[PDB]
From a paper:
Due to the critical role of helix α0 in membrane interaction, we also prepared and refolded an N-terminally truncated PspA including helices α1-5 in the presence of EPL liposomes. For the truncated PspA α1-5 sample, the total diameter distribution was narrower and ranged from 235 to 290 Å, with two maxima at 255 Å and 275 Å that were closer but not identical to the apo distribution of WT PspA. In the PspA α1-5 + EPL sample, we determined a total of five cryo-EM structures with resolutions ranging from 3.8 to 5.4 Å supported by visible side-chain details. For the α1-5 PspA variant, we found only five rod diameters (235, 250, 270, 280, and 290 Å), whereas two different symmetries (C1 and C2) could be identified for the diameter of 270 Å. None of these structures contained any additional lipid density in the rod lumen. Although the PspA mutant lacking helix α0 shows no structural alterations in the helical rod structure, it can no longer tubulate EPL membranes. In support of this analysis, when we abolished the α0–membrane interaction by removing helix α0 lacking this binding energy contribution, we did not observe any membrane internalization in the lumen of the PspA (α1-α5) rods in the cryo-EM images. Interestingly, when the protein was reconstituted in the presence of membranes, the ATPase activity was increased by ~210%, while the activity of PspA α1-5 was not affected in the presence of membranes.
Author numbering:
A (entry chain C), E (entry chain Q): 169 to 217
B (entry chain L): 113 to 168
C (entry chain G): 24 to 56
D (entry chain B): 57 to 112
The structure:
């Protein structure tokens, strides 16, 4: 049991050391990549259809 | 009846122990946090630029 | 020399930006548990 | 101080460009949040900007 | 129990050391940011609509 929670603290301490992405950034890196794939592919689906 | 009732006491008491131990971690963590937050705001107060015997 | 305190006082503050860094780690650790 | 100001505006420029990506094509709402986020970075730029002029 | 109130005093003593914002200031930092976002975005919603 103490092993498991010892692992929990190592991972959690790393998170504050290197914060995970904010949801706001998460929304665009998918939202923009959709056109970053579709817009390039919209050019491709127009360029190369 | 005696053996069953006494076991109930132990079962009830054992649960209450680990519950208390969980709270000890939280209260200590908040305390060590609260004491720390104070002195940054105090050392800042030493250097705060407030014209209150501030070094700056 | 008053100018020397400015360095040492800031030196003291480097201890808690890590110490308080431990306090958050413990709190998040308890939350995960 | 000059270098720090340049970095801040680059992040604002990136968020500016990111809002220049958002507001197009009908999604002004995500631009609102991005601009709302951008305002935090805009404030930092203004404060450093005048200090650089004063320090000159 | 004495731990909890001991925490109360540490936080409260810090508050007088560093006062929290007055409601008057609170009213504008939201009220101005609305146009600080809308006015910039009103320029954007006019500049970039």
């Amino acid at each position: 049991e103490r092993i498991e929670t010892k692992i929990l603290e190592l991972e959690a301490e790393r998170e504050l050391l290197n914060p995970p992405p904010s949801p706001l950034d998460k929304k665009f890196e998918q939202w923009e990549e959709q056109q970053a794939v579709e817009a390039t592919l919209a050019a491709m689906k127009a360029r190369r259809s | 009846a005696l053996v069953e009732q006494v076991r109930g006491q132990l079962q009830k008491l054992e649960r209450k122990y680990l519950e208390l131990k969980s709270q000890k971690n939280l209260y200590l963590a908040r305390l060590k946090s609260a004491i720390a937050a104070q002195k940054i705001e105090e050392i800042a107060g030493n250097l705060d630029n407030a014209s209150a015997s501030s070094l700056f | 020399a008053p100018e020397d305190l400015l360095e040492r006082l800031l030196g003291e503050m480097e201890l808690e930006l890590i110490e308080l860094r431990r306090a958050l780690a413990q709190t998040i650790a308890t939350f995960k548990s | 101080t000059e270098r720090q100001r340049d970095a801040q505006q680059l992040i604002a420029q990136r968020w500016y460009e990111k809002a220049q990506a958002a507001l197009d094509r009908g999604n002004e709402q995500l631009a609102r949040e991005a601009l709302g986020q951008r305002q935090s970075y805009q404030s930092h730029t203004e404060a450093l900007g005048k200090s650089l002029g004063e320090q000159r």
